[PDB]
Structure 1
Amino acid sequence: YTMSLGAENSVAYSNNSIAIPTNFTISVTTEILPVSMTKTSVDCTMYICGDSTECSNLLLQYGSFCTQLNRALTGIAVEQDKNTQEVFAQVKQIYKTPPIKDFGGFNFSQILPDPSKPSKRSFIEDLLFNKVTKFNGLTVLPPLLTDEMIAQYTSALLAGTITSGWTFGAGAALQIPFAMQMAYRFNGIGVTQNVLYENQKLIANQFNSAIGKIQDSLSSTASALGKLQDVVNQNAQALNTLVKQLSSNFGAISSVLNDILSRLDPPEAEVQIDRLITGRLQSLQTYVTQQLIRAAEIRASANLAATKMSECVLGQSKRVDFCGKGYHLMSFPQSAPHGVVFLHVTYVPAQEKNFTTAPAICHDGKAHFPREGVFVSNGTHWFVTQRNFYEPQIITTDNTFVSGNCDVVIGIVNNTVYDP
């Protein structure tokens, strides 16, 4: 079939109509970013000329290829640990949560460490780790930071984001009640503080239910972590193929080296081994080149993840879709094999109402504009209210400022401004 771009829609645009939300929702979106690769390293000599002296003495005639490939792979392996450090080691200190879990009704037990476990990881981190899956010179170098240390870093960042908000990124961690921190995060998206306080239990319940939905989504299906698994698979292929290229002949009489050495004298084993060496060296070069490109790709993804942990976790971003679909409130990191997973908590208006509107009004021939908000009318009376939540207020001089008169502005209307 010809695919559907989406459900068509028509916006009821009109010069005197505005839709304003009367309510909201708290969305929690999972953004998965791969950070590191497998620190693979190959002994070119042993891969090409395993346990062969004539083969190695012939290989020396090709110069520094062996060493150049080893150097490139070493650089890649260093770059991977550098990426991990850049992403998670954005904090000098290891903050910890108190036993008093009084967060205004907000629940973080499903992302904070489970101290009863051997690995100080969270439920969701365990889900993520469980949703993700030789003698020819190929070795796997262990990463510098163990998953336990990654988890310590994530716990530190989480505890800072909770207890102190964004202050632990600027500098010293400054404790503040979580609800007031969320009030700041609401005032940062054009919504007033009261909304949060008056809807605090509702907001906390929405947040906890969203976390539960995250648990369900990650437990049910694994495809969500594809961006990580794919990476692994790619590297695996690039290794398997490489190993497979040992079993080929490349024009020689055999794909084995000792068999040639046990059948031919040097004058001809040299030619056969030259063919084998050329083939295997070309295969190694192809592998290293593909791995350098993939490493560049992973470095880009890791720098993006670090920027997200800075502008998203350590702060509150006004960048759109950089930190989840919606108005960004905050985000929480959760490690994963060779990557990171941001839970972005966002404010999504949900219940909207039509209101007649007007850019200004007339009181005594003068024109009043809203200081912070818009003028609306339900049909009979006019109000001024903030533009991301319906909280109608009486129109006064404290909610508006005067500029000019009513012979200029277009769409201006009439109403009475109350002077306290």
Structure 2
Amino acid sequence: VSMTKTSVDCTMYICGDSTECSNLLLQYGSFCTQLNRALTGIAVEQDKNTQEVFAQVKQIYKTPPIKDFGGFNFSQILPDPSKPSKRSFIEDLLFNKVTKFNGLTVLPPLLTDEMIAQYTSALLAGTITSGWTFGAGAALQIPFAMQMAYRFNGIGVTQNVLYENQKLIANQFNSAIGKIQDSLSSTASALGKLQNVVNQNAQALNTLVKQLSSNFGAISSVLNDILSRLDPPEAEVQIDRLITGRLQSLQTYVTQQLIRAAEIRASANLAATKMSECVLGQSKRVDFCGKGYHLMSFPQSAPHGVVFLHVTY
């Protein structure tokens, strides 16, 4: 869904605490007005991707204290009230697999991970207690045994198959939910899409620091080494080779991050469509909410992304 918000400074990165370097940077125009306007609009857009996906409904629904859903066990996706962090058993496994002074700052996100988990728990209590009615008006109380009688009719199956085989469907649902808990506790390569976002944002910042030790055709890389050796009619030439060599290193980082922000924007618009068509209703599109005949879906939280659990036929 989202990326890591960051912001770079032009004064401390180009000029390492030098007032003689800042006088030559003013002759280059307004290069750093554009570099700070570009990274600001990215960090605003990363807070907008979490609003169109998670904040689909604004009324917080709650689970009733007694569990009677016709034999279905939702104890793996409902949040645990005993833990201080309101997460489920699957959300605790997803948060354990995904793992300076030169003007580099990391701004914190607006929506906290605790507040994201309240958006996911409010939608899990809507598709169970109401189904599809809380996304197109007011919430209407429908029992869970009567919800699948309508969802089976959408794929061309009569209501005699569900009601005469209520024990067979409920046993196959609980065995398929618990199979993901045994799968996510063993293999860690299932979250490779969320790990590539962190690794690409880490190599883009490690390259920006290692380019400060380059000479770019000058005598040395330290700005204090040139001012304490050279006369200012000659020290201006060696400094000007370092300003141009470090300005092109900053323009590559902003340009490469503006294409990654457009790639993560298309993945947030796709995830916002699946939160409304697969979760808030039943979709007739093939290979959109899973392979086969789609019945219902359950959203889950994840670091810098979402995790869907489609139920098919």
**Normalised by the shorter chain, which TM-score bucket?**
over 0.9
TM-score, normalisation: structure 2: 0.97
Instruction: Decide which of 260, 284, 304 is 1:318's aligned counterpart.
Output: 284
State the shift of 1:267 in Å.
Answer: 2.0
Give the distance between the partners of 2:217 and 2:56, measured in 1 at CA.
Answer: 53
Number of equivalences = 312
Change (3 A) 1:209 1:252: same
Secondary structure of 2:98's match? Answer: coil
Is structure 2 residue 80 aligned with structure 1 residue 117? no
Provide Cα deviations, 1:203-248, integer angstroms capped at 9, x if missing partner: 1111111111111111111111110000100010001111111111
Provide Cα deviations, 1:32-60, integer angstroms capped at 9, x if missing partner: xxx00000111122211232212122112
State the shift of 1:307 in Å.
Answer: 0.5
Give the distance between the partners of 1:203 and 1:190, measured in 2 at CA.
Answer: 17
Secondary structure of 1:332's match? Answer: strand
Give the distance between the partners of 2:310 and 2:32, measured in 1 at CA.
Answer: 46
Secondary structure of 1:242's match? Answer: helix
Say if 1:242 and 1:284, in contact at 8 Å, map to a contact too: yes
Provide Cα deviations, 1:308-337, integer angstroms capped at 9, x if missing partner: 001011111111111111111111111111
Give the distance between the partners of 1:273 and 1:322, measured in 2 at CA.
Answer: 57
Provide Cα deviations, 1:344-385, integer angstroms capped at 9, x if missing partner: 111xxxxxxxxxxxxxxxxxxxxxxxxxxxxxxxxxxxxxxx
Provide Cα deviations, 1:258-303, integer angstroms capped at 9, x if missing partner: 2222222322322222211112111111111111100110011011
Say if 1:164 and 1:173, in contact at 8 Å, map to a contact too: yes
Instruction: Give unmatched runs, 5+ long, in structure 1.
Output: 1-34, 347-420
Give the distance between the partners of 1:253 and 1:277, measured in 2 at CA.
Answer: 14
Give the distance between the partners of 1:81 and 1:233, measured in 2 at CA.
Answer: 20
Say if 1:45 and 1:66, in contact at 8 Å, map to a contact too: no
Give the distance between the partners of 1:193 and 1:133, measured in 2 at CA.
Answer: 46
Provide Cα deviations, 1:387-408, integer angstroms capped at 9, x if missing partner: xxxxxxxxxxxxxxxxxxxxxx
Secondary structure of 1:56's match? Answer: helix
Equivalent position of 1:415 in the other structure: none
Give the distance between the partners of 1:47 and 1:193, measured in 2 at CA.
Answer: 68
Change (3 A) 1:251 1:188: same
Give the distance between the partners of 1:101 and 1:271, measured in 2 at CA.
Answer: 77
Runs of 4+ in structure 1 deviating by more than 6 angstroms, as ranges, are none
Secondary structure of 2:295's match? Answer: strand
Give the distance between the partners of 1:134 and 1:194, measured in 2 at CA.
Answer: 65
* Identity across the alignment (%): 100
Provide Cα deviations, 1:180-206, integer angstroms capped at 9, x if missing partner: 112211111111122111222211111
Is structure 2 residue 82 aligned with structure 1 residue 77? no
Give the distance between the partners of 2:308 and 2:175, measured in 1 at CA.
Answer: 17
Say if 1:249 and 1:276, in contact at 8 Å, map to a contact too: yes
Say if 1:131 and 1:225, in contact at 8 Å, map to a contact too: yes
Say if 1:313 and 1:331, in contact at 8 Å, map to a contact too: yes
Give the distance between the partners of 2:230 and 2:102, measured in 1 at CA.
Answer: 24
Equivalent position of 1:61 in the other structure: 27
Secondary structure of 1:167's match? Answer: coil
Secondary structure of 2:244's match? Answer: helix
Say if 1:257 and 1:273, in contact at 8 Å, map to a contact too: yes
> Looking at CA atoms only, which structure, 1 or 2, has the larger radius of gyration?
1
Change (3 A) 1:96 1:265: farther
Equivalent position of 1:108 in the other structure: 74
Instruction: Give unmatched runs, 5+ long, in structure 2.
Output: none
Secondary structure of 1:344's match? Answer: strand
Give the distance between the partners of 2:8 and 2:154, measured in 1 at CA.
Answer: 51
Secondary structure of 1:42's match? Answer: coil
Give the distance between the partners of 1:257 and 1:277, measured in 2 at CA.
Answer: 10
Task: Using the TM superposition, name which of 94-103 and 261-270 deviates more.
Answer: 261-270
